[PDB]
């Protein structure tokens, strides 16, 4: 988990690599050992990492140099818990034991047996989310000085997916929209996601196991709390071998980058790989990238046998549908994270209507510019192409050719280095013969002869006559003859007169 700016990871039974992302490379990273902690969860709050096993629970003091030592330890009256930075909501068997730094119950929050034992504990950084034994979750705001309920008690998972085994809860920043996987039962064991939208007390649905993976870590994106960046390793039942690669390499670990709509369930945007430096787990998501994991080791010092401290074992996986996002400003972040919410879910208010209809006086750097994936270019043409702004120009150059519908947008869609997106919508607008004959434009004019045959034998002769004149232009004579001859109407000149003049009949024209 990347929490509170500290991308803490646990790469061993006791080794907890509590890496603050701001640690200097010459400063030591997160190094911490547990005393054989049967860790059912850890809760770190900017220097107080509490780990618990079910018989003891120690809070670890951390310096800014990531020097992690136990500040305090206490027994557990119940296995799981969650800390309000001094006072730990414990997963008590009948309530929320808000136990103190020393493990004594400072405050009392209650969930009855209709809720069940409050076994799942999480403070969603302003909202203590308490999924109980029957998953009846009431979420507790802490924006004052202590806990106070925010989202009412309601089942985290629906009856059609409560029988599906509920594992944990990924409560959103507001502490109502709680993502929670449900794996299938013992005969099924297929992972579905129940994003408990506590805004409306509904239960979202996304069966990942047929849909591509079995996700391991769940987290919402740290910038937009509707972008559920679903870390996803491909694990399946014996019916879903589709996504996985062959045999032992069956984990093409790609994040289900997902903008969860609070109404229509989980709606997906893209499959973004974690595989960034041997990385198979996404531990966070910053603005420009996704904070994935990496191998945990100690870098050797350059030019010597010494060992420099590691910079960060946190690989920032660059996010791919967000083009012109990261080099650009933070109006890009709002505008086009909003547009990508309109991508996965499907909306129009955010990137366009919410910024037109408010009387907002400025001239932004990126009103919105990747918005062509919902087929609109003018937001990257008057914000950008009034002066052709460069840090959103990636999706602007995409954007002049994902307008491609053969409605004069083909011609704009083919200007310079950008016919490929015209071809992408040639596929999309059911004209992949134009995919073919304009993929011939990308420098494929040698086997464009046979792909032209695939298109038209009129296109065959167009490509052979152009290609025969192409090496006639380079200087070749006989090969010019052959591809002239291999053109059906290039053939009507070359055997006709002497086989030897397409260069020389071309020569007398300047004389004329």
């Amino acid at each position: 988990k990347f929490r509170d700016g500290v991308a803490i990871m646990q790469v061993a039974v006791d080794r907890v690599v509590l890496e603050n992302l701001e640690v200097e490379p010459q400063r030591p990273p997160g190094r911490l050992q547990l005393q054989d902690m049967q860790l059912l969860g850890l809760d770190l709050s900017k220097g107080l990492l509490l780990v618990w096993d079910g018989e003891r629970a120690e809070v670890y003091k951390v310096t800014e140099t990531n020097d992690i030592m136990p500040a305090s330890q206490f027994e557990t009256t119940s296995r799981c818990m969650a800390i309000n930075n001094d006072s730990v909501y414990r997963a008590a068997e009948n309530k929320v034991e808000v136990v103190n730094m020393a493990g004594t119950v400072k405050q009392t929050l209650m969930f009855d047996d209709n809720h069940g034992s409050p076994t799942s504990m999480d403070v969603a950084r302003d909202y203590l989310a308490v999924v109980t034994s029957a998953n009846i979750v009431r979420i507790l705001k802490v924006a004052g000085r202590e806990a106070k309920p925010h989202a009412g008690p309601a089942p985290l998972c629906p009856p059609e997916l409560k029988d599906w085994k509920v594992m944990a809860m990924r409560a959103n920043g507001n502490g109502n929209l709680v993502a929670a996987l449900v794996v299938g039962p013992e005969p099924a064991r297929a992972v579905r996601l129940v994003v408990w939208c506590g805004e409306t007390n509904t239960h979202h649905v996304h069966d990942f196991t047929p849909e591509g993976r079995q996700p391991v870590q769940l987290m919402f994106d740290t910038v937009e709390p509707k972008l559920l960046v679903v870390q996803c390793t491909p694990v399946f039942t014996e019916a879903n071998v589709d996504e996985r690669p062959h045999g032992d390499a069956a984990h093409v670990v790609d994040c289900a980058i997902i903008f969860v709509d609070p109404d229509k369930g989980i709606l997906l945007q893209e499959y973004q790989p974690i595989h960034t430096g041997g990385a198979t787990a996404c531990i966070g998501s910053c603005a420009p990238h996704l904070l994935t994991n990496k191998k945990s080791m100690v870098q050797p010092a350059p030019g010597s046998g010494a060992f420099q401290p590691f910079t960060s074992n946190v690989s920032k996986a660059i996010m791919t549908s967000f083009q012109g996002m990261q080099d650009s400003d933070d109006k890009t972040r709002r505008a086009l994270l909003d547009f990508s919410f309109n991508l996965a879910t499907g909306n129009m208010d955010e990137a366009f209507r919410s910024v037109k209809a408010i009387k907002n006086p400025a001239v932004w750097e990126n009103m919105a510019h990747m918005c062509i994936r919902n087929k609109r270019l003018d937001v990257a043409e008057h914000c950008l192409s009034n002066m052709e702004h460069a840090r959103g120009a990636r999706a602007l150059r995409e954007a002049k050719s994902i307008e491609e519908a053969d409605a004069r947008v083909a011609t704009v869609a083919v200007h310079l280095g950008m016919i490929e997106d015209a071809k992408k919508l040639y596929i999309a607008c059911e004209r992949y013969d134009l995919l073919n004959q304009l993929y011939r434009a990308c420098g494929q004019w040698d086997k464009a002869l046979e792909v032209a045959e695939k298109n038209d034998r009129i296109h065959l002769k167009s490509t052979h006559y152009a290609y025969g004149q192409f090496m006639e232009r380079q200087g070749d004579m006989e090969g010019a003859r052959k591809h002239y001859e291999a053109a059906g109407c290039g053939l009507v000149e070359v055997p006709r007169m002497l086989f030897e003049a397409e260069k020389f009949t071309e020569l007398q024209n300047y004389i004329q």
Binding site: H382, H415, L416, L438, G443, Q474
Partner: protein
């Protein structure tokens, strides 16, 4: 510039590097009446002409063999370019020069040949540039013997050498280098940039449309259109990719409807954008310049500008 001190004609006088009063030699092309001052100045022994090139021009002053390639046609015009100031022996008085090698005369009376620093580098027999012809590629890109560089980038075999010579020849208006690069293997879409060429011969309409297709250099493209068969192609690119840096330039002089345009999308880039104040101003003058257009008092575009004025007064 003064009196012609020395005349150095060719066999026909269609071109000549004559000397001025100061002593500086000046290549003259009276076929199309063009004068290019040679970068070599001061007194020379003679301008002997390359028997291998009427444009490449050796000045042998007894000190150096100042070769001078003459390039008459480009994006700009005639130019005299030094292919090398390479020394000559005093006893080797330049009788004639062939293939960049000056055939001089000995003191006792004989024939001696004096090469230059880079002309013989590209001539065959220089196995340094034949067994390892990448040097021929480089030095033919230097001396603009680029067909040697074309062949040598074929043999040293990468795309970027082809594109290097392709742009180096596109600057001097040669395109078969670019064909050899791109139509063998190009980036994505330059062959549809070549396919959009008309039967018009002024080279400024042509290159201006070419870089309209490349979506670049729109000020120079609009300027070249102002010298073209149509000036309004400049304003066309200006509504094609939404500029006002010269849409206003052609709009004040040609089309108040284009002023109304510029102010309509200026209101627009201030309507959805917000600051509906200057958007309101631009929408209002879009309505006005639609009314006072040299074309129609266009009612539907003015009604769209009035929907703009509705929202911008609304947010004003």
């Amino acid at each position: 510039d003064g009196g012609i001190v020395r005349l150095f004609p060719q066999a026909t006088g269609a071109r000549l590097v004559f000397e001025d009063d100061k002593g500086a030699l000046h290549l003259f092309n009276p076929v199309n009446d063009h004068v290019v001052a040679v970068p070599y100045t001061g007194r020379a022994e003679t301008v002997m002409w390359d028997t291998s090139d009427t444009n490449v021009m050796v000045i042998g002053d007894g000190t150096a063999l100042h070769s001078f390639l003459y390039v008459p046609v480009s994006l700009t015009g005639p130019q005299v370019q030094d292919l090398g100031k390479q020394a000559v022996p005093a006893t080797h008085t330049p009788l004639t020069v062939c293939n960049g090698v000056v055939g001089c005369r000995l003191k006792s009376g004989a024939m001696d040949n004096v090469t230059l620093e880079s002309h013989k580098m590209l001539q065959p027999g220089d196995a340094v540039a034949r067994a390892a012809p990448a040097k021929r590629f480089a030095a033919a890109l230097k001396l603009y013997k680029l067909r040697d560089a074309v062949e040598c980038a074929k043999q040293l075999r990468q795309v970027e050498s082809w594109r290097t010579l392709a742009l180096a020849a596109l600057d001097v208006l040669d395109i078969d280098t670019a064909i050899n690069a791109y139509r063998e293997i190009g980036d994505a879409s330059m062959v549809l940039s070549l396919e959009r060429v008309r039967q018009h011969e002024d080279r400024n309409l042509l290159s201006a449309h070419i870089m309209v297709l490349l979506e670049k250099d729109y000020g120079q493209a609009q300027e070249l259109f102002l010298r073209s068969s149509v000036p309004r192609a400049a304003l066309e690119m200006r509504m094609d990719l939404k500029h006002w840096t010269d849409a206003l330039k052609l709009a004040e002089q040609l089309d108040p409807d284009a002023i109304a345009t510029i102010c309509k999308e200026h209101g627009a880039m201030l309507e959805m954008t917000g600051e509906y104040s200057n958007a309101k101003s631009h929408y209002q003058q879009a309505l006005d310049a639609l009314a006072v257009s040299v074309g129609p008092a266009q009612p539907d575009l003015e009604a769209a500008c009035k929907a703009g004025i509705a929202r911008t007064t609304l947010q004003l």
